[PDB]
Amino acid sequence: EELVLLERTLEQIIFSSAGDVNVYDLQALCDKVGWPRRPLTKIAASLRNSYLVATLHSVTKQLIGMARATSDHAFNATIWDVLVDPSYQGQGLGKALMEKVIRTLLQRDISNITLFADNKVVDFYKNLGFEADPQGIKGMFWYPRF
Amino acid sequence: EELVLLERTLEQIIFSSAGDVNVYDLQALCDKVGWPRRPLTKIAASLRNSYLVATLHSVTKQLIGMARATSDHAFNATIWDVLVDPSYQGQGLGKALMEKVIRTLLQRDISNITLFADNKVVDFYKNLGFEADPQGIKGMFWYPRF
Ligand SMILES: CC(=O)SCCNC(=O)CCNC(=O)[C@H](O)C(C)(C)COP(=O)(O)OP(=O)(O)OC[C@H]1O[C@@H](n2cnc3c(N)ncnc32)[C@H](O)[C@@H]1OP(=O)(O)O
Ligand SMILES: CC(=O)SCCNC(=O)CCNC(=O)[C@H](O)C(C)(C)COP(=O)(O)OP(=O)(O)OC[C@H]1O[C@@H](n2cnc3c(N)ncnc32)[C@H](O)[C@@H]1OP(=O)(O)O
Ligand SMILES: NCCc1c[nH]c2ccc(O)cc12
Numbered sequence: 001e002e003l004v005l006l007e008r009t010l011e012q013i014i015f016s017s018a019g020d021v022n023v024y025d026l027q028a029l030c031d032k033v034g035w036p037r038r039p040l041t042k043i044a045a046s047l048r049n050s051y052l053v054a055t056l057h058s059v060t061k062q063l064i065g066m067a068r069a070t071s072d073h074a075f076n077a078t079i080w081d082v083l084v085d086p087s088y089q090g091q092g093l094g095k096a097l098m099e100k101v102i103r104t105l106l107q108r109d110i111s112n113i114t115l116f117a118d119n120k121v122v123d124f125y126k127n128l129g130f131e132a133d134p135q136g137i138k139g140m141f142w143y144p145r146f
Numbered sequence: 147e148e149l150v151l152l153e154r155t156l157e158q159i160i161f162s163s164a165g166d167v168n169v170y171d172l173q174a175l176c177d178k179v180g181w182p183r184r185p186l187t188k189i190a191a192s193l194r195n196s197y198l199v200a201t202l203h204s205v206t207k208q209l210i211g212m213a214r215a216t217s218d219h220a221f222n223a224t225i226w227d228v229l230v231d232p233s234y235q236g237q238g239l240g241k242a243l244m245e246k247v248i249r250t251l252l253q254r255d256i257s258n259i260t261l262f263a264d265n266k267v268v269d270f271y272k273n274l275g276f277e278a279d280p281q282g283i284k285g286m287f288w289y290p291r292f
């Protein structure tokens with residue numbers, strides 16, 4: 001359940017669905033992306049209670065991409081926090097990470113694969129096959145403060 | 147955690163967040179609403195892997211309502227399969243069950259409470275405080291078979 005995606009020269013990219021993601025490495029990444037720090041114990045609790053945590057590492061190991069899902073292990077899953085290191089965006093890695101994520105969940109027989117997308121990346125997911133408000137279904141938040 | 151909601155005669159409604167829901171009683175309720183049969187092993191796996199399951203019982207026990215939620219135990223929950231017996235709809239019980247669900251989750255310190263609303267009941271969740279597509283964020287499904 002580990003893979004080597006590509007090899008370049010002057011490093012590789014390794015997808016994993018294991019879960020060895022060090023909350024300090026992840027923190028480092030979220031910073032690069034400008035996210036605000038969250039209690040590392042609470043981050044560690046979210047990775048532990050996530051049905052699927054998928055990783056891209058850049059060996060020469062180095063966290064350069066992550067996605068994770070919750071799921072009821074049976075019917076539904078929801079994809080959260082898929083992020084890719086700025087100096088690796090625009091290379092196909094977000095696509096590859098997502099493709100394998102979906103594939104992993106299909107292989108575990110999750111039939112309903114959902115997520116919530118910012119307006120600026122909705123197109124990135126429609127290309128991957130995601131379909132917004134199908135049949136007038138709406139995705140709702142309790143008193144969001146964004 | 148177990149509460150008595152109302153008392154009537156000619157019976158009391160009981161809210162529980164305990165989790166002990168019989169998959170046979172649940173399947174009975176999903177037929178009463180016309181849902182399709184699903185592998186009891188899988189139904190049972192989706193309840194055990196649901197961060198919160200909340201039940202409505204009619205004692206004189208009879209399962210008359212249910213809602214569950216997945217969560218990463220830290221940041222996000224998603225509320226699925228909330229349903230109440232047609233014999234008991236129109237009485238406030240859907241509303242009561244939802245309020246306590248939300249309160250239980252806030253209690254547990256989940257800050258992001260989300261769900262996916264069918265068209266005919268989107269209004270029902272707006273009245274409870276749920277806001278659709280807040281500032282551009284779209285709920286999305288991968289190749290929905292609807
Ligand atoms: C799940 C949620 O709740 S929201 C998701 C959270 N994710 C984030 O916000 C992370 C922030 N964004 C990023 O880190 C990245 O820029 C991503 C993940 C959005 C894109 O990752 P990248 O690696 O740059 O994209 P990738 O290389 O896979 O590009 C894939 C394809 O989508 C297109 N694409 C790339 N970025 C975007 C974008 N921002 N919007 C729309 N399309 C895009 C690319 O052109 C490419 O097209 P093609 O291959 O068909 O020619
Ligand atoms: C979770 C998801 O994925 S989407 C939702 C999934 N659930 C289902 O599809 C099951 C279908 N739902 C039902 O059968 C139930 O009727 C529910 C869940 C919609 C509501 O249960 P009820 O107990 O009948 O609703 P309840 O009696 O609590 O009524 C609460 C309030 O909502 C209103 N309401 C009831 N049904 C609806 C509706 N379809 N749309 C909007 N408002 C509604 C009621 O008028 C009432 O208003 P008021 O108290 O301000 O006068
Ligand atoms: N789900 C709304 C997008 C979103 C989800 N989690 C987030 C965390 C930080 C942030 O800036 C944005 C988000």
Ligand SMILES: NCCc1c[nH]c2ccc(O)cc12
Pocket residue numbers: 181226227263264
């Ligand atoms: N709002 C009910 C739509 C619906 C129809 N069939 C379903 C099965 C499962 C579920 O979560 C939802 C549905």
